[PDB]
Assembly symmetry: C3
Homo-oligomer: 599 residues x 3
């Protein structure tokens, strides 16, 4: 009996108190400790060497306790550790072993989930230092790392990076690096208050699968000029993605350096998220340097139904090569996104774009293999002052991209800066169902709406359709003489173009090519013969040898004659058609025509 | 030892029984009470003054117990209170203090989540009375209220409003009012069986952020003629939304009064939901009266990938003004929705529409500032008998709206009732990729498919394309003489129009305007001169002074001559072209032409 | 006191140890057993007849214990049973009673949820036998079954089917059959390693509502040639769907037999999912045989924003009839999907398609009633070698289907095999905004891009637009003489067609029909009269009696004359136009024209 009181007060006491669920005679006859052992929290490991519980706080380093918890639960085949609500748990030292090569704090282990209901904060030990808060690699060399499987982090809690700036631009900082990660996820968590490189990374160079970030918040994760670059989630394994997240930055530096998501492997997605205050929406890129685990192709890439206010580019496409591997990007869909460039001065952040075809990280524009991309059903808006805003900035070689049924309301439709790169363009398709807005009407002095500053364009379609006037622009579409153009279709619808001096401009006369199909409006001066009755009219100028037919876009204010309704050409480059002189006389008129070639 | 038995049976007993997790020697030496204290339920507060547990039931008011639980957990920095499964917990009185001004039952508190696994019912004390079941305001005056932060309500449970009708139309009833709410959400819950104004409201006049309703059900929440108006979720803070919910009504009154969602602040969404039995899908509105917390602009508004059977309008757009604030709506996307008007008689519910540009709550149509809206990739269907069905009912001033690649199968495409409002319309864009269905073919006697009953139309595009015949309609598009039309493009594709007497009708001759670009089919009678050889044909009528060119849509059944293939005009308003008389003679023919002006 | 030690060690011991939450004097004075009774796990029933806990393992059949748990919790109004993490729980026998008719293992009960954190495996007792692991029917005859309501299965755990092959093709195997299921769901679970017919089925012949599968994984669920057919989720009740799931197969048999989802009742969806290794994406079908619970119409069907690599067809549409019921499919949207046919030889799996209009299960093609379908904003790709790849394989009667703003990059656009079925086609709409890719350029010898192998086509639109050349194809569009064509619009844009011998081909001369509206390019030889001045040119051939106008697509390399720019016809079927002879002489030219009829 002495001994009984002793047992009951001992740590084995609950193991002596019987329990049967709801007094049910068919239930297991258990002990209290058995039922308590079905759950586990940080409190079960957050104790001193004598087993006395330690209270968390700014002057307590919780790291070793949390690691002990993870280690122990891992040893039993897994489970879920709760990080209790109503407490802030500070981390105040680096981890040891395999994660030290990654500046790791906590090592994640397979099947061991974390339910973060309270707050995890970084203590000032980490000020000006690199860190990766949770790491799933088990080796300093990721190539020699084991996998992390079935690890979920979820809850209503918070990871707070303590506000600390980077100490040097070369440093790396991360929230969760799942590593070579298979069926891992983060759900519900708020990441906030730091200066970091990534909040979450999924996979490693294509090793991993089925990793997701869902219903998380990322708030104020860049705060300094030291921060070299920030991408909030970096998706580096296939069959993985980001859904229904919220991303916000307030720093000025974030407007120049921060991107919300990167998709770097096949069968990856970015959907249903809201972004504010970032430079960029998403990179969609196949790096040859990352091709080890899942091949050299990024395909089935999806960016859909997101909402964004950014300062630079919404989606950036890329692929590149190494000495022995070539990366390819194909089968991409960008749809349903509503995006705007936030209020800013022209040229005060990276050049505004809905899509950017960017050069590689060395600036090379002749290594890319990007094709079979569909951009459909998106809206884009930039305020009227933002000269540096385009539907697509096409700055590197492009093997195809298709635009259907978007609404683009910005300075340029297609742009690339002259005397920069000279991309080779194939299979650029701009369907007539793309609606060109009018916010930048009157701002386009000296500018071409479609500024085709490329080395060459083949197998491309540009069907221009205005929906309001903008007589300030120099042309709707212009090809410099250095841009070859072949096997293409280029049309300018006449609506809102009557008063334009230039509609389509071919500075090398490239619309003459055998397999170029074009149409655009032009003003033409004609003169007739004197004959009464059916009578020819001929253009005064001889620059129409390429024209297959033309037809009037002007009314005839005369009674005594009419010019031809339709024209063909002659070998000397004149247009010619048959009009009617009710009364004879040489006539001379200036008419707006629709010039057509092979259409 | 006497004393030990006593301690063990006392309420401090579990605090004397030791426990160490899984017998792990490195785990904390705790007491049973410590582990039990990691969770909390309603049972921990649902007790009489002596501490004896009280069973819930229809004759027990659970309100004070649940409030006590919330209050206590709030005092510890938060946590999650479970509302146990297998019990119905009745609420039978009003709350006190700050929530009394809101007819509040329970006051929510920051960081205190509710996991509702059982059922919460309203007792008949609430019959014919106002109530707001859960309220996050802490003051009767919302302007003087504190915030609610980090409050989540979730579970497999149920909030049941007891079936009670409203007592007076002026009363308000709500399920959850989060208040000035930051990172709050409702997930998984079924709201059912009532007559209420809202089930959930998020935010207050733009104060709040990151509030969401996800995977909830709302069933039968209007049941009486007294109910003035019902909107199931009212989103009144930015960076907030509704995703993957189910909404159903069976009441006849709901078909006239109920809307599923309202989006009232920037960066808000409504996605992936299913609606049946409601009048309306969503309001997307910037009320000046609600502009305090987040500015005067609603932008980045998203309605996507929903499924609906409604009786009135799917999306209703609006903005309005007060004495000192002006509200603006811009940058909206409506995409991927599949919607139909349910079976009903014509005019038996509010006028059926996919989009409605509605007047303000006072009926004013000259205060709105709505622009940069994209409606793309949606389907809409109304049964053939529903005369009052339109793709857009445009009833108030519109500063722009763009339709691309939709499928609209209803009575009207564009409509506004004559002798009602006379909206000023700018930047209405109806792309040719909008497919017009054929359900209402043969029903359109006396009606114009595009009925342009506006004060004026500028910078607009209407590209009509039929996909089957409907010879019952009076015209494809008609402009009354009171509607000014300028700087616009209006086209009628000829397919399925050969037999139409009227295609495009300009009752004020507005197609003559200098910057109007049109084309449409017409039948024209021509007569030739007698000359053998090339010979002019001239229209008998003189109403073509606006025509820039025309071309034949008819075959020539003659051998001895041919009419012109193409025509221009003359100053007297005749058309003229050059045909061919193999043999001489005056000819007289009636031809279907495509009339063109500046296109 | 003797007696006290005894009570404490007994199974009623925890019922004698007092507890009050956090020492709060206003909290309930409870006993430890009360707090433990708030949760329940399998361990509470996994015991021998004496109440001693049994360890799970390969040689322990856990079935009776899990059933006992479900039964008991059901008796208390429900709750959630945990299936503990860190253990595999084997099932090794069949259930008894109502579920025996369904080869059921476990019977689900209303309000009793399962939180599966560990693993559930099938023992080899099930090798070569039928089984349905969890069944919600309570009767062997589903027609006499009660309902299952409010049953959720969720967690990070796993259902493993043990790898066992089917014993006979006629056998059925399933993971979860919810039965006549109302507010039931599966969330988070991994189904893997089997040879089964379905993983999950929702509803029964239209009985059920609000059933969902969310964030689950289905991995390797076909493994044998015996397996007759596999569809991973079969949705057989309305207001139900599949969201954000992952489906993968590696078996060769799956490429021929497996589909990811079937939608079989109204108001159902399939969204945001990733599929690899399957034959098919989704069936969307109204079976008359399944019309009992929710009517004879499947409407509001949504397939959106999915990512797929399949070997056969992405979406298959269907409806059929029984002796007394007729099934109808209408109001369908397919949008935002990015799909490809995986690498395979031509004809090595079922014919590749984005959409298939399939015959019924008996092969009948004259029973379907499918209409009001919108296919918009999708991408589809098949590798160049896959002859058997189409945007739509149209193999049964079709009452309407609309394609807007897709990107299809495969061998055929519209296809049906000749001398197979002869479908009746109405309201097939192929908008010009559909972009036709170029992967299969040069592969189309002998083939028609749009191969119209139908009994008849009415009220249809085909607007062909190429975006690169493919001179290998026999035609862009061909109608055999056996296909009637009326009240339709068929156009071939001229871009990339100059060198094509055949563009549109009407083998029965059907383009002559009164209400056929067409345009396409053709080469025509003309001869003029000798007259100096305005002079007629006439076609040598007489096959143009149907032509309403034509215009030049060729330049004029002559100085001394010009052919007409535009032409009409004459009764003998010649074309005729007026050109100009600067000098006299009979001229003879070959010109590319755009032939037009009523457009
Ligand atoms: Na490192
Ligand atoms: Na493409
Ligand atoms: Na060049
Ligand atoms: Na009030
Ligand atoms: Na717009
Ligand atoms: Na007016
Ligand atoms: Na059976
Ligand atoms: Na349709
Ligand atoms: Na036939």
């Amino acid at each position: 009996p002495d001994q009984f009181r002793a047992i009951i007060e001992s740590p084995e006491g609950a193991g002596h108190v019987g329990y049967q669920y709801r007094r049910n005679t068919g239930s297991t006859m258990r002990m209290v400790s058995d039922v308590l052992d079905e759950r586990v929290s940080l409190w079960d490991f957050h104790c001193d060497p004598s087993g006395n519980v330690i209270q968390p706080g700014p002057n307590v380093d919780s790291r070793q306790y949390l690691q002990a918890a993870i280690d122990y639960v891992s040893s039993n085949g897994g489970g879920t550790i709760t990080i209790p609500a109503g407490y802030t748990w500070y981390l105040g030292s680096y981890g040891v072993g395999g994660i030290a090569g990654h500046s790791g704090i906590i090592q994640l282990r397979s099947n061991v989930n974390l339910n973060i209901e309270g707050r995890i904060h970084l203590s000032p030990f980490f000020d000006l230092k690199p860190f990766q808060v949770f790491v799933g690699f088990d080796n300093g060399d990721p190539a020699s790392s084991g996998n992390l499987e079935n690890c979920h982090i979820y809850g209503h809690g918070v990871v707070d990076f303590g506000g600390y700036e980077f100490g040097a631009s070369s440093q790396l900082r991360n929230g969760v690096a799942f590593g070579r990660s298979y069926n891992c996820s983060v759900t519900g968590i708020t990441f906030q208050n730091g200066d970091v490189t990534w909040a979450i990374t999924l996979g490693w160079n294509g090793y991993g699968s089925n990793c997701y970030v869902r219903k998380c918040r990322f708030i104020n994760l860049v705060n300094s000029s030291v921060n070299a670059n920030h991408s909030t989630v970096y998706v580096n394994c296939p069959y993985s993605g980001v859904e229904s997240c919220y991303f916000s930055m307030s720093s000025s530096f974030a407007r120049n350096i921060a991107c919300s998501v990167e998709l770097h492997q096949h069968d990856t997605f970015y959907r249903g998220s809201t972004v504010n205050g970032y430079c960029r929406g998403a990179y969609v890129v196949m790096h040859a340097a990352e091709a080890a685990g899942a091949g050299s192709y990024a395909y089935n890439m999806q960016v859909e139904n997101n909402i964004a206010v950014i300062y630079g580019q919404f989606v950036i496409l890329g692929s590149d090569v190494t000495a022995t591997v070539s990366g390819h990007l194909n089968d991409v869909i960008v749809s349903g996104n509503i995006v705007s460039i936030g209020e800013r001065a022209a040229f005060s952040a990276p050049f505004g774009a809905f899509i950017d075809i960017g050069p590689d990280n060395s600036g090379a524009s002749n290594v890319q293999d990007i094709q079979r991309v569909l951009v459909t059903g998106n809206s884009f808006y930039a305020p009227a002052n933002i000269t540096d805003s385009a539907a697509i900035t096409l700055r590197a070689n492009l093997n195809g991209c298709t635009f259907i049924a978007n609404n683009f309301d910005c300075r340029y439709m297609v742009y690339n800066a002259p005397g920069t790169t000279s991309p080779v363009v194939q299979n650029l398709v701009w369907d007539k169902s793309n609606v060109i807005g009018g916010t930048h009407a009157n701002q386009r002095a000296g500018q071409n709406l479609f500024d085709m500053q490329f080395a060459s364009v083949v197998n491309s379609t540009i069907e221009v359709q205005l929906s309001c006037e903008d007589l300030s622009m120099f042309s709707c579409i212009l090809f410099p003489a250095s841009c070859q153009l072949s096997y293409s279709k280029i049309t300018v619808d006449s609506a809102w173009t009557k008063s334009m001096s230039n509609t389509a401009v071919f500075e090398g006369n490239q619309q003459a090519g055998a397999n170029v199909y074009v149409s655009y409006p032009a003003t033409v001066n004609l003169t007739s013969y004197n004959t009464q009755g059916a009578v020819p009219f001929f253009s005064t100028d001889t620059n129409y040898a390429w024209v297959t037919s033309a037809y009037s876009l002007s009314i005839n204010e005369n009674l005594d004659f009419s010019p031809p309704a339709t024209y063909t050409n002659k070998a000397n480059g004149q247009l010619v058609g048959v009009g009617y002189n009710e009364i004879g006389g040489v006539r001379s008129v200036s008419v707006r025509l629709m010039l057509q070639r092979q259409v």
